[PDB]
Each structure stands twice: as structure tokens, then as C-alpha cells.
Design a protein around this ligand. Structure first.
Ligand SMILES: Cc1cc2nc3c(=O)[nH]c(=O)nc-3n(C[C@H](O)[C@H](O)[C@H](O)COP(=O)(O)O)c2cc1C
Ligand SMILES: Cc1cc2nc3c(=O)[nH]c(=O)nc-3n(C[C@H](O)[C@H](O)[C@H](O)COP(=O)(O)O)c2cc1C
Lengths: 167, 152
């Protein structure tokens, strides 16, 4: 008999190569009493069997999704998300990639919207120095944008204010 | 935020006409820290989002609610999943047993035939917890305790 993993019906599905997005996912999962699930081992049940789904991904390659998200994208595109509450967060580097800042979060946004999800947790782009971002929609990010490389001093406040808006 | 419903990853999906299987499924769920879900309102998520799935059914043949909603079973991925069965009463437990082994499930929780009948539920033993709330009601608490010990 294995535990469900958390008390609340919140699944935080993440990808990570160097551990930065993985640690942020655990921080989000703790405050929402949810499960942190790596997209490498995630199933479509992890996408479907939750009242609040949160997807997080860093941007790698050439403005692409993290490789595990790219490979396992079928688990998302085959998941029933119509009318389901979904939030997103992205890790990025606006100093070294100002023209592809947290683009992976924008790519996740197009996927969940394609599956009919109701996305919440839009944030503002005010305190960011970047030229282009696929996560930007009319002066707003489609989710929580974090920069653990050149702006990690603001991550705690950004997560704190973002979390309280998802409940 | 919505609670998942239980601490342990155990889903007890049952059918009931007169409330006997419903009280048993609720008791089994409380002992195993699981959720009890009626097949009438169960979803495919209820069948797949658990490490231990438990199916209960009365015999009337398979209870009509299970038959009408049997697609929730046949359309769920149970390959390699731990599934146990209980039956109130012959037994529709065997008809449900044939459904889950088709889906590639790993059935656990077999019981012995100790303690009067002439039963589709194999190889000299029961495919699950056989219960009789019409004459052996007081013993049910014991057979559940032994059944839970075999699952934990
Ligand atoms: C090869 C490479 C390409 C990157 N491309 C981008 C990019 O296009 N946009 C961005 O915002 N960050 C980009 N980054 C920064 C990472 O997304 C950032 O460091 C992130 O926090 C890494 O998360 P992880 O440690 O969980 O893998 C890139 C990093 C590397 C190494
Ligand atoms: C019309 C009818 C037929 C039944 N047929 C069987 C049967 O074939 N085998 C059996 O073990 N019990 C049989 N029973 C007993 C019920 O399965 C038993 O009372 C059960 O606990 C009822 O569950 P429920 O109250 O949740 O509907 C039958 C009961 C009725 C009323």
C-alpha cells in the first residue's frame, strides 16, 4: 500500500537538466500540498487525475522545450484537459537568451490550450529585461517566469505571490 | 484546493442495489485509507489513478450498474496494476475477475473456501473476498481483517 503522494489534488509535472526547475517544482508542490512528478516518469494519469495541474520547463537547445518534455510530449497531447485548471512556470536566462526567454513555457501553453485547458496564473513582464518571448501574450506572461541564472534574488517573492493566486 | 480523498492510494469501486455492498466497500475503504466510489459515478481516472484497485459487486449475474458501466473497466489501462476483488452474496466476483485479467491486471488477495455452496469466482480457491451479509454478517469484520493483512 503506497501513499498517494500528497493531500491535495495538485500535480506539478516538470522537466530538468541541471536541477534548477526540479527544485522549483518541489517548492511549488510543498506550498500547494501537491506531488512533484518528473516528465520522464509521468503518465497521462498524472496529467488527468488532478484538480490543479502545473507544468514547468526550462528552455534549452535553441529556444526549445527541455529534451524530456520534447520526447514525452505525447503524454500531454493525449491527455484529457478540457475545462481542467492548468498553470505554468518557466525557468530561463534573460541575460544570455533575451530573444528566446522562457520560450518553453509558451510552447507548453500552446499544448494545454490545444487540449482545451483553462489556463490560470498569468503574470506581468514588468521586471524583466528581454527582447522576445513565446510565453508573452499582450504584455503578460502565460505563467510564472523565473530566472535562476541572473535574477535568482527575486525567485522567492515571484513564487510566493504566484502560488496564492492559484487557489 | 481539492483533497485527493484519502491518504493511501487505494480506490474501492463498488456496485450496490440495496446498500449491502455499499456499506462493505465503505468499511474496506476506511481500513485501507482509500476512497469508496460508486460505479454509477466512477470515472476511468478512478480505475487508473491508484496503486491498488478494489472492485466490489453483488450477484443478482453481474449487478446491472456494473454491466451498464462496464466500459469504464474495459476502456481503462490496468496492465500490470495491482487489483483485488470482493463479492457480496455463486458470485459476480468471477465475472469481474475475467474482466480485469483480460486487461492485463495483476490480481492479488485470493482467499480460502473455509466456512456452504455448490461459484464462478478457481483452482480450488476464491479469486477474492467472498462475503455474505445475509447470514454471516457478524463474521465479515474478521474476514476483512484477514483480507487486509494479505494486501498489506
Ligand atoms: C544550451 C542552453 C540553452 C538555453 N536556452 C535558453 C533559452 O532559449 N531561453 C532561456 O530563457 N533560457 C535558456 N537557457 C537557460 C536555462 O533554461 C536555465 O539555466 C534553466 O534554469 C535551466 O533549468 P534546469 O537547471 O532545470 O535544466 C539555456 C541554457 C542552456 C545550457
Ligand atoms: C433477486 C436476487 C438474486 C440473488 N442472486 C444471488 C446469487 O446468484 N448469488 C449470491 O451469492 N447472492 C445472490 N443474491 C444475494 C445478494 O447478492 C446479496 O443479498 C447482496 O448482499 C446484495 O447486495 P446489495 O444489497 O449491495 O445490492 C441475490 C439476491 C436477490 C435479491
Amino acid at each position: 500500500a503506497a501513499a498517494r503522494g500528497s493531500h491535495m489534488s495538485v500535480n506539478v509535472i516538470f522537466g530538468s537538466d541541471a536541477g534548477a526547475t526540479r527544485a522549483v517544482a518541489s517548492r511549488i508542490a510543498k506550498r500547494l500540498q501537491g506531488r512533484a512528478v518528473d516528465i520522464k516518469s509521468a503518465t497521462t494519469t498524472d496529467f488527468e487525475a488532478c484538480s490543479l495541474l502545473i507544468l514547468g520547463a526550462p528552455t534549452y537547445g535553441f529556444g526549445d522545450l527541455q529534451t524530456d518534455w520534447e520526447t514525452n510530449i505525447d503524454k500531454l497531447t493525449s491527455a484529457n484537459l478540457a475545462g481542467k485548471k492548468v498553470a505554468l512556470f518557466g525557468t530561463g536566462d534573460q541575460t544570455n537568451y533575451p530573444d528566446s526567454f522562457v520560450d518553453a513555457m509558451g510552447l507548453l501553453y500552446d499544448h494545454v490550450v490545444e487540449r482545451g485547458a483553462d489556463v490560470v496564473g498569468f503574470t506581468e513582464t514588468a521586471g524583466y529585461d528581454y527582447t522576445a518571448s513565446k510565453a508573452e501574450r499582450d504584455g503578460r506572461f502565460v505563467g510564472l517566469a523565473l530566472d535562476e541564472d541572473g535574477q535568482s534574488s527575486k525567485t522567492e517573492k515571484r513564487i510566493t505571490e504566484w502560488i496564492s493566486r492559484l487557489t
